[PDB]
Amino acid sequence: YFCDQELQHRVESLAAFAERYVDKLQANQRSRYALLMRAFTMSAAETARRTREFRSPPQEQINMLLHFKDEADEEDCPLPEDIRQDLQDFHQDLLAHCGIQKKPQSLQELVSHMVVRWAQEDYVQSPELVRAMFSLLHRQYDGLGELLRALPRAYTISPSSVEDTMSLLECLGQIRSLLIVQMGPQEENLMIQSIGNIMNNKVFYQHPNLMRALGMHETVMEVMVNVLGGGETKEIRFPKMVTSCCRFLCYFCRISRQNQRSMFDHLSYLLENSGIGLGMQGSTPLDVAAASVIDNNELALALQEQDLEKVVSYLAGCGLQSCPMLLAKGYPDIGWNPCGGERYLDFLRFAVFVNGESVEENANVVVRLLIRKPECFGPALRGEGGSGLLAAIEEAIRISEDPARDGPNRVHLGHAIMSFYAALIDLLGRCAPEMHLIQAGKGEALRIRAILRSLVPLDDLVGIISLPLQIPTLGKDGALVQPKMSASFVPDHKASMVLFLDRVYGIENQDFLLHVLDVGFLPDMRAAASLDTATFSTTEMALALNRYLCLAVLPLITKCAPLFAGT
């Protein structure tokens, strides 16, 4: 404890010198930049100094300012000698305080002579005593490296935020104190309360690095790992506790890209535990993985092939059988779990398509793992007895029409079939290769397009696009019936296969352009034009149809406008 207090003193004074010296550096850099702008008609060397002092990364320029560690490179730094002497003197003082340099004259000498004399006097037979005395020896001999280990957890904050960090640390302490307790109802409620307080804290987004250093993401990961660990037997215990888990973890990934990287370091556990996480209404570990992989190409290219294989095999399993929870609730037995595969397809979409550019490296692996197991595609697209997209979707419409199959509702399986196939076609057209790769004529890109065109024909795409879509109908006494919008057909399903149709099987000939224009496109925009009436204007179907049009249909027309000549 005494030596830990010494380490605390060293860290605190390092922060103190940080404040004192960075005030000087900030003022001097501002004055140098002002004088260099006051220098009119800056030369090439002056422009290099200007782009070093200004319009440069703050980290890079502060390293360039502190880079006078060695006398050979001291000439490169632009800081004054009097200013840099302060840093040199405090470094010397820090070495003196760390002991770098008869009776002991310091805690370090006292502990060293104590432990050496003790182990010289007798063979200590208590392993805990041996470990403690040699740990004391290690820290006393190199407390400088102990400072190296301690500084990652050193984080200076503004004096005005101290009350919010008080609340943050108190809630984090509650979370840590509940670790040693077996999770019960009261502990779960306290954990949810503390997690919500951390969410509502302004520091949680103001200083993401503070939470990264505190490792509270690791702490809530420990809580979540314990929770799933017990949940893996039979049903998951305290689903709301896992809801608060990613609620924090999902958001933590969105808070920062480095936070997203740290959460992506534990991507492997999330993928193997997505099997038990699936079926839970709330944010699941698969969603943590999605949040850890969304819109970050740096770690998207770092995504691994067996990591893709896990989600592919789970998608295959959901395709192979039916949802046990749905069977328990009493939904008609089908041998086909669409809601299970929907979320894995969602994760695959996020794994492939990022920042408006599909990753070839991951798209090829995803389609390879998809094609080695045709069981992923469900009863449709099957090697034999797979019918087609048209038969599957139209039969699903008939399934949702009657209560014999639709009724056992929170989740309607008639909508589930359509949603799974929409997500599957979305993932396929979303793994589809790039236009510039096709123009370069890359063999693998042509083969991937060939496989997709072999799996899904143009007829199935156009026929479902032209499939009738029930509109909100105004019955008696102004009683309109807006479509269920979660149990029935939605143009969001059509949008994914429109994306397919424009990514592969893209518009090349005018006749086929018109073919698809009068089949399922022109009726769609005419239906939206009729839906523009004020009674149906705020209709949920109207909003969904407008989004579908303006995101899938209309850009196709904009990019195929040159083909419209001579119509």
């Binding site: 850099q29 502060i62 010289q120 690095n209």
Partner: protein, 378 residues
């Protein structure tokens, strides 16, 4: 953005990071030899308990006994211990300081012999105190799982076994034959299996990510520095085959035959053909890497450094094989004759010739061609 508009607390955080990196990390300290010498001194026990000729272990001996005890403790796996990791580093530096030396005139016979004696004494200060047994116990405890423990234990084993000293070699052989433990050699076999090779797909992914521009959270950096995903565990695999070479150094036929055949032990693992298997795997990986670079006559700097670290691993594996067969040990020679060593070196000859002409054509690849010829002479 310039530092004048930065908030003071953020500037202090960045100054902490910059100080951490560029001042105190760059500053180096030397305490290992002093601390190990203080632990090795027994103090005044020779005067305090003269009646008993055999006395209690000195502090260093108690330290190694504690580590050996934690190694032998029944476990399902090995856990992380900063204590053992730091002490392994300290003792390794202390006993290999003489090997490290802590245009030039050549060393006289007396000078080099005195340096060898200093190395032998530094290594004796650890292997008379059970470090040779401790490193074997740690390697057995790792159970083939890579990590900081097996890394530090392998570095410590190299630091004890530098120069191939017969005392440490004989002590390790005695412990292995006395315990008849298959765990050590099973762990070693699993370690060569977990050692990786050139990953060309990872090279393509790394190249695309490097060409991609990105932004990190604090400030803005064009490309955040990260370890190369290709030829990972390069230090670990070079260290593992260096440790095996030090085990069979000095033409000790007892270790040279014990690696091939475990006569006393129930299960026999042929570490020689495991080394051949990893050599063939690395041969295939280098062949694939060259074949990808065959069309591009100009090799990128990333490809050059990746080739260099790959051929450094191959150089260490080849030196390990020489050591396995450097003495006229008929068993190892016969096993290498009957293994796939010839197929692997056929592939090596193919890659060598094509690198030779292709790197000779380009004048900027002369250093890579030089290190290539060094690998070929191995």
């Amino acid at each position: 953005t310039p530092l004048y508009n930065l908030p003071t607390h953020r500037a202090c955080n960045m100054f902490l990071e910059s100080y951490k990196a560029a001042w105190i990390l760059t500053e180096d300290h030397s305490f290992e030899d002093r601390m190990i010498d203080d632990l090795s001194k027994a103090g005044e026990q020779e005067e305090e308990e003269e009646e008993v000729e055999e006395k209690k272990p000195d502090p260093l001996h108690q330290l190694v006994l504690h580590f050996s005890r934690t190694a032998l403790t029944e476990k399902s796996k090995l856990d992380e211990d900063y204590l053992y990791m730091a002490y392994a580093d300290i003792m390794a530096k202390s006993c290999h300081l003489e090997e490290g030396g802590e245009e030039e005139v050549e060393v006289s016979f007396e000078e080099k012999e005195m340096e060898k004696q200093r190395l032998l004494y530094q290594q004796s200060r650890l292997h008379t105190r059970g470090a040779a047994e401790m490193v074997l116990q740690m390697i057995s405890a790792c159970k083939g799982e890579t990590g900081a423990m097996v890394s530090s234990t392998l570095k410590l084993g190299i630091s004890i076994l530098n120069g191939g000293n017969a005392e440490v070699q004989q002590k390790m052989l005695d412990y292995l034959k006395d315990k008849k433990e298959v765990g050590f050699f099973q762990s070693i076999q699993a370690l060569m299996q977990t050692c990786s090779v050139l990953d060309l797909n990872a090279f393509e992914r790394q190249n695309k990510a490097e060409g991609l521009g990105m932004v990190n959270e604090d400030g803005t950096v064009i490309n955040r520095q990260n370890g190369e995903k290709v030829m990972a565990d390069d230090e670990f695999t070079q260290d593992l085959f260096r440790f095996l070479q030090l085990l069979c150094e000095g033409h000790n036929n007892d270790f040279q035959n014990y690696l091939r055949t475990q006569t006393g032990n129930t299960t026999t693992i042929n570490i020689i053909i495991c080394t051949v298997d990893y050599l063939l795997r690395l041969q295939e990986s280098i062949s694939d890497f060259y074949w990808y670079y065959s069309g591009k006559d100009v090799i990128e700097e990333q490809g050059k450094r990746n080739f260099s670290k790959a051929m450094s691993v191959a150089k260490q594996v080849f030196n390990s094989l020489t050591e396995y067969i450097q003495g006229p040990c008929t068993g190892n020679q016969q096993s290498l004759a009957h293994s796939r060593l010839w197929d692997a070196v056929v592939g090596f000859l193919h890659v060598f010739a094509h690198m030779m002409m292709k790197l000779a054509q380009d004048s900027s690849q002369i250093e890579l061609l030089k290190e290539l010829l060094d690998l070929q002479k191995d």
